[PDB]
UniProtKB/Swiss-Prot annotation, chain C:
<keyword id="KW-0732">Signal</keyword>
<dbReference type="InterPro" id="IPR010827">
    <property type="entry name" value="BamA/TamA_POTRA"/>
</dbReference>
<dbReference type="GO" id="GO:1990063">
    <property type="term" value="C:Bam protein complex"/>
</dbReference>
<protein>
    <recommendedName>
        <fullName>Outer membrane protein assembly factor BamA</fullName>
    </recommendedName>
</protein>
<dbReference type="GO" id="GO:0051205">
    <property type="term" value="P:protein insertion into membrane"/>
</dbReference>
<dbReference type="Pfam" id="PF07244">
    <property type="entry name" value="POTRA"/>
</dbReference>
<feature type="domain" description="POTRA 5">
    <location>
        <begin position="324"/>
        <end position="398"/>
    </location>
</feature>
Curated annotation (Swiss-Prot), chain D:
<dbReference type="InterPro" id="IPR011990">
    <property type="entry name" value="TPR-like_helical_dom_sf"/>
</dbReference>
<dbReference type="Pfam" id="PF13525">
    <property type="entry name" value="YfiO"/>
</dbReference>
<protein>
    <recommendedName>
        <fullName>Outer membrane protein assembly factor BamD</fullName>
    </recommendedName>
</protein>
<comment type="function">
    <text>Part of the outer membrane protein assembly complex, which is involved in assembly and insertion of beta-barrel proteins into the outer membrane. Constitutes, with BamA, the core component of the assembly machinery.</text>
</comment>
<dbReference type="InterPro" id="IPR039565">
    <property type="entry name" value="BamD-like"/>
</dbReference>
<comment type="similarity">
    <text>Belongs to the BamD family.</text>
</comment>
<dbReference type="GO" id="GO:0043165">
    <property type="term" value="P:Gram-negative-bacterium-type cell outer membrane assembly"/>
</dbReference>
UniProtKB/Swiss-Prot annotation, chain E:
<keyword id="KW-0449">Lipoprotein</keyword>
<dbReference type="GO" id="GO:0051205">
    <property type="term" value="P:protein insertion into membrane"/>
</dbReference>
<comment type="function">
    <text>Part of the outer membrane protein assembly complex, which is involved in assembly and insertion of beta-barrel proteins into the outer membrane.</text>
</comment>
<keyword id="KW-0472">Membrane</keyword>
<protein>
    <recommendedName>
        <fullName>Outer membrane protein assembly factor BamE</fullName>
    </recommendedName>
</protein>
<dbReference type="GO" id="GO:0030674">
    <property type="term" value="F:protein-macromolecule adaptor activity"/>
</dbReference>
<keyword id="KW-0564">Palmitate</keyword>
Amino acid sequence: LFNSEEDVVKMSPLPTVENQFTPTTAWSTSVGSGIGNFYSNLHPALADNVVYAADRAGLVKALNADDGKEIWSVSLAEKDGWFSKEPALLSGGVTVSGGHVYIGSEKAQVYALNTSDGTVAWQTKVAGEALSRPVVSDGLVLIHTSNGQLQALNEADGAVKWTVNLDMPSLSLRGESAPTTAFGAAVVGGDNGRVSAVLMEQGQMIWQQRISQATGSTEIDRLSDVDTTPVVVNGVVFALAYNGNLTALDLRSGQIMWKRELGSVNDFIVDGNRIYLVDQNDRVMALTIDGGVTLWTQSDLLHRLLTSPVLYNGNLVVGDSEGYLHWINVEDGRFVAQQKVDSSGFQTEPVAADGKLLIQAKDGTVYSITR
Amino acid sequence: CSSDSRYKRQVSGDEAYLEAAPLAELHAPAGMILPVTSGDYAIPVTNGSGAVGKALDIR
Amino acid sequence: FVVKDIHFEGLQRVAVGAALLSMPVRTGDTVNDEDISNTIRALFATGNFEDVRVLRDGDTLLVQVKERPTIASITFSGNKSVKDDMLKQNLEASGVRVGESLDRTTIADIEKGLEDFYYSVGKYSASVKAVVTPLPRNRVDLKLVFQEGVSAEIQQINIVGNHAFTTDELISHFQLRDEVPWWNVVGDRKYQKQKLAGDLETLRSYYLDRGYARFNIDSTQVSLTPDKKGIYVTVNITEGDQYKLSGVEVSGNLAGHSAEIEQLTKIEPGELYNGTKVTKMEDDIKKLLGRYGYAYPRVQSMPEINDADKTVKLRVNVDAGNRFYVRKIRFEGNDTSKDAVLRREMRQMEGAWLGSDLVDQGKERLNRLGFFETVDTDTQRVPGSPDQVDVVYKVKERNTGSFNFGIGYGTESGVSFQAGVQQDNWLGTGYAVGINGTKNDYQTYAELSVTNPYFTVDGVSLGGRLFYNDFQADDADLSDYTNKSYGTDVTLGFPINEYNSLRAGLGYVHNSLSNMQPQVAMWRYLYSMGEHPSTSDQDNSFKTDDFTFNYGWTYNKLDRGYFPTDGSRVNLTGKVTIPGSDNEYYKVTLDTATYVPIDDDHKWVVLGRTRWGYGDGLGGKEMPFYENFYAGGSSTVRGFQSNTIGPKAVYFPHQASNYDPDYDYECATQDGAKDLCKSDDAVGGNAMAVASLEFITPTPFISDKYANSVRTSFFWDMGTVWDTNWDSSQYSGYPDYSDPSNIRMSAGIALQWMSPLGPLVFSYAQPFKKYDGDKAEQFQFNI
Amino acid sequence: EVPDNPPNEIYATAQQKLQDGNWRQAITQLEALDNRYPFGPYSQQVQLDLIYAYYKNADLPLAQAAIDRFIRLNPTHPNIDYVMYMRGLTNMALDDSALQGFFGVDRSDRDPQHARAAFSDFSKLVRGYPNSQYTTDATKRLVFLKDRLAKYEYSVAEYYTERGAWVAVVNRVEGMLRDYPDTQATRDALPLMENAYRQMQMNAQAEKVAKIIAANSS
Amino acid sequence: ERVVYRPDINQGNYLTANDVSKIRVGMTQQQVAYALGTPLMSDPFGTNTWFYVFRQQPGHEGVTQQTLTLTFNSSGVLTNIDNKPAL
């Protein structure tokens, strides 16, 4: 029957399934079909002892961040306008700031779901759908949109503080350049391979620094969905290009402090001096903060489609897009635990909040994990 | 197999161009004068070496 | 240092001095230390030199050369979908091919560029390594190994900034379709960005025609989603508001055709704005002035879109040419037929004005020719006067000739055969020659059908047809129905309109029958002839010389004369007898073929093909039984066997057939099966009603170099033939066939494979419902 | 075809299958010589032997490509006369060919497409090399082709007369008149333009042609 | 003949009544060619005669003709607007 339609080139799996510690779930509290195998920048936030849980279909939950029991739930699928009764279709993910849950929808609508009931305490349409989850801070709803437009909306009403185009690639070159405000400057990375800093006060470009290549005439990797969210360790911006090529660079000027411009990083955290990251082969590597000199590495998730690395229960936790969870050593790369709580996959960054670790799987939705 | 060409020719061809069609020059009387030759019709009459037909030299 | 001898170590495609002239230093030139290193790069600037080691023996230069050139081959592996010549075109885009300089530096360059090509495919998960494999003296094979994982596909289209139209019906306007269900299976998928720009306008037009003259697209942003497959689109549009085309302000060089132009600007002032038909009405004048002699009718509209009342006004700038553009014409692609064969299928004359459509109907006449491959032209402006346009009718012709054969009696048994040949446009003349005939022991048939289609300049279609059958169906020479039949028909084509065209002919047939089978309705015709022969013997003879008057008429709007796909044409035919005929009768007939494109790219076209017939006597007589109606099998109705649709006659109670063969050729005879046995073959009626409904379907796997010459079509075959004179008295316990419920049913697909001597028809067809007396062959091929 | 071998082994075998009449094998070694050794010394003579083998294999465009090759490989050569002959000699044979020769049916009213291209290269030979070893037969072709183009031009001058487009009659004859000084078809297209003139009331312009007919009575 | 149906015989390259007014005897050829362009028949033998002849036959009921020859001098200055009607 199916011995003949065969044409596939290899992806490397997950080796080294070790449970030095035993993993588990803290509970399981599924939304529905949530983040989805559909590539979406919806992502649940965790705060207030409330699993502020959601899906692109419309169901805005609140589950308990103790056992996942319904604190409030609304369903906020769209209604009409040139076509009636759409699902919510969230472009930006869950941002719970204050008494609002700010979620960007793929209708370029950014909301503010009132954290007592998730009622839209304000809705504002933004400049294209949210390529980054809304970084809602300093009175601003800072969004890197699909067109790379830095929104800023008055987070009490969504009143637009500004909209400014960012580092702009040729298309939706898929990279979350999530606008972090650092030292009064909304520092952004870029899906056009550059890294900027823009003003947090009004959206004025502090600088822009080209890091490395984006797609087009230097055709680069389309597995490096880059963490162009900058983590400015106070004077030194840490962010990527669009190809993943890591650098360290100045806050005030963007002058390159150092770079790992060969390392096409996918996900990365500046974990002290020990930069834990996701390699281009989905592998895990610990780097220095001075040249990105490898402090340790791990190929036990070679091309196994990981989430971001996080430290929870003392060890480097990471999930994959295959439903597995991986407690990597914070030392040289050993699985201290492995939990397959799901098969539907994870691309959510694991939220080590409320004392717990809450994720939404793709359609095997919201799970809380511990060991 | 059988002796005609065994896999092969006696395919139709042509040879009439070496015969060089006899052409009697058109005469125009006075007042009937138009330029009787134009186009690529310019044949320098040269009986330099080789001959008519396949008696022209063949390499 | 001055060189005594430059030593050229290995060249292998280039010459010795051609390298030496490419050097900055010649053997004997002034030598500098830079010139030696310049000799390194300038021999590298030969491009055929892989390594170059310009050294010198004190001053005696010694140049060690390794070599790029002729690439021995270029090999390709893993090119499951992509043609390797396209991959070689990207090699040829890099200036690389077999037999060329191999630069070992640009290897990963092209390996990028083919993936950069794989990028532009709609993939990216397809990776190539170019492998250098050396051959003698300089040569190199270039293995190219393609590791093709997966393509990208239609996933999502978001149009933010859309505030008028539904994306779902918009995606239905587009071809960016992303659903083939499992229990509602329909449609297809697989993105290409070349579809995008067409579907960009499919958005834009669908705004434009509605009134949205302030519609625009802000931007469009396609996901470069990793997995190299995720294609989610952020379209940004300004949907605009709707506008009212509220008046045309057309003027310019209206060339005195202003009201005619005003007929083409008969608009509703205030209707919802539609620039598409506005664009069309611009062209309406352009053909109108193209009818009026103006091949360059510069028509420039101006939509004064008045946003103050949400309307549009319409200035249109008009600038015609000059009338007598048709100076002359040229005809190209005619190296096998005469020029006036093509020039007679035209409607515009040289030394005249331009009628734009006279070219086209003339080209439609050449489209209705059917000896062509292409119909086009080159409407060549001859520069100078605006009266010199010389239309160079470049077209492509096509082959003819087709032999027809049955299946088998010769070369093992006696010399007996079936033949039928076609020579249409006989040797580039237009002459349609169609000749058939068969000489067996059971028959000796001959037939010709030759046509001078243009015997006069109207298209007097001198269609002469002859036949001479020495038919026996012999037991020995004659015991069972030997009938020599012979005669002629010369039939002529008449201009009636440019599609309407009549037919009229005359009939000589002398049948000379003998030893006839005792079939009742067959002999009921004889008793309708007042001829009452011996029902229990086959000795009975008949000499008829029937004299008929044939006729008919055709309409023809059917586009390709040889590979017809759209249009509709009528074929009325018929015949009637005259005073002097041995039997007074008629026969009326018509056949249909409709061509309605389901897909309007015509890969799906409705084909409904029916055939009609009625023939009886003119009063006091009867149609002869050899003029009955037949269908079923290897035909327009197939899945059956041949002659399986119609009435079914019964033998008279019979004895010796004057040599009935001993327990062979039974006719209720002496030799078994006595006393009103019934034959179950279709003997046919006085009425025909037969149809065939077929469905144009493409072939994906066949290369469209030669899939375009191939038409696959599923069908249903169904029809009925009965006799209104068929009584259910003799045919009481025997089946009666005075019914329109004599229907048969079949289905299947035909296979039109075009050989170099014509299309070859094959069909495994399946008889679904069989009426009485049907016999079936499933796999049936029309040669 | 024939691998990277001794070139003269490839060359003589090419000459052998040229001598054999094995033109499908003559090209098989003639090309595989120049496939491996296009820089060969007799590779230009191979090029002329290719044009010899292609034409004898009836490879008229491949002959023309080798004619174009010997154009491109030898932009100046005294065997371009061959190349200028054999291109027109291709274009002589490239134009018209049918089985109807034994039936006495002729294609000189067929489209003289390459017979236009034959008249160029044959005359380009007897202009560019009017002393070479190809001038004699090409001049025979050109004299024959001048009427062939005219008999083609006669056929449209014929056709418009029964078509009755009398402006289209005369301009076809004028195209014969402006081009051919000597073809008998133009001598017999003469009254048609005269008749079409008399159809178009240019009887006086036709009596000009009647004087030309009087001058072309002999 | 006994048939009445005939497909239409047509031939243009004529001059309208507007076309005759655009020129005059004494205009040069170019002065006529600015108005009328060239004809699709000129005089190859003698002087500049610019033949513009209409020809048409519809329907078994006769032929229409409108011949308009423009005979200039040798200098191409117009000497005769010869309009010849049908027969």
